[PDB]
Amino acid sequence: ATAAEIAALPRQKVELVDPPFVHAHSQVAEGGPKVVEFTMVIEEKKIVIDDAGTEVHAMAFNGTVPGPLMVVHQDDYLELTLINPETNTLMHNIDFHAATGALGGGGLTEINPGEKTILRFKATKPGVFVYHCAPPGMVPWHVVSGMNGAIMVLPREGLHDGKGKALTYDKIYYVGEQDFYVPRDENGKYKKYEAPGDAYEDTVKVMRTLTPTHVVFNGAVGALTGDKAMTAAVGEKVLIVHSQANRDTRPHLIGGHGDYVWATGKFNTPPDVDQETWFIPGGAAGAAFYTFQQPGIYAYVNHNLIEAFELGAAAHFKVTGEWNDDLMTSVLAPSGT
Template sequence: GDSVYRYWTFNGRVPGPFIRVRVGDTVECYLRNAEDSWMAHNVDFHAATGPGGGAVLTTSMPGEEHAFRFKALNPGLYVYHCAVPPVAMHIAAGMYGLILVEPEDGLAPVDKEFYVMQGEIYTEEPFGTPGLLTESYDKLLNERPEYFVFNGHVGALTEHFPLKAKVGETVRIFFGVGGPNFTSSFHVIGEIFDRVYQAASITSPPLTDVQTVTVPSGGAAIVEFKCEVPGQYVLVDHALSRAERGLAGYLIVEGEEQPDIFG
């Protein structure tokens, strides 16, 4: 049977919606906490300059709504998350996402863009237990997750929504770590990142020809590569024991075989 978990979310999804603005834009955020919510929620934007990233201004009890605005002063790819104490619990329950602040000229065009975030789930029940799972505050405090996931649940980017591209296409992955606790060693098995915007700094020159990129909790990176050979590529955190706890995604590349490159 399936394992089921009660997530806390932004807009009913994990990660929350991908937000895309331009440097210098004023961003207006409206946050409404559902009537049937169990507790207060808010949002802290790492892209905002101001106390708490907006957390205090958006803190809403069940049934309440609040709004605030911030000016996006710095280009980059930034995490946002709920920051109601205990913050780690709200993040582990799914309340995280990414906001891209594009530079004045935007980003260079690519064929495919993907949004991937890594997170942890802490449950009383052992990994793989069927039925409704209970969140474990003890395991959270001791940083012992039962699950490591891409995009919210085991299988999200494998059997459910694999990434897809064609031979010859260029791919950009906006990658972030909600966490709340673990740093990712992000790697795509069988691919080399042509360009990596380390720490998601898009105003710095990218690193070139990179195998694995470190992405801290509450941080992000942008990786770009060209798909040269067809087949199935596996997205992992190269701390590979985590693959046994659910952390994997597929990029399926379709097209002609390329025996001069691989075969």
């Protein structure tokens, strides 16, 4: 498209919402290509990531870890206003893995506290994609302080299976998984600090072990449970988008499956089917579609079960509806032999 063709397209402003929900959008595009406008404000903030009161100095797009999901259609333009408020201490930027050129946008969006910038890129490839901060010389430190999220670039005709049949979800959730590297003192207790830059050296030492102290969804142990358990009903079709900007993961729905999984996250790569556990490499997003068939509490985990049940990587779905005895029944409930 020429600059005059892009000038003539409609603009749409979107209000973002906190993960794991996703802002309003249409699965099939409503209209020709648009320039879709988003704004995120970077907040350097303390987050508490476990029930021992462990703290992280988060570097949080729109104040959440992960940052929020942006949704556009293929060949729309995503136009981001990124703001780095004067109350922050570090320079930040943004790399969209969905984008083409200038290190994903990072080369064009380096903003010191008190600056803003506006980047536009054409979303030429359909899929779910990581975005993350990447300041030269400090890249993994920002990413493993929670400065990452994902976008979804839907095909203009919505999702389809490998054979071209429509897949339409009722619900969509976004699970961002985070590896944290929290320094400990000589007694094994997690250290606290009064500014992000005070933890830097201690944290690089833990990062270089390649062994996270915590692996969590939505920024904390247990965050996607209780008030934030994800909801569905028997018969509803749910898309679960999962990202991990730095480290591999292997998502699994305990008691369910991934009926269709774009494990690579890319919708022109046909999805795998009937998955028990799928694999998303560090630096990517993936998406699984499932139709619930049984009610109950489900857990949703990274299936390194030490990562899930010792280090924090477990969420719940609460699912209403009628039990199906054909699919599963207790013929004899636990009872003396």
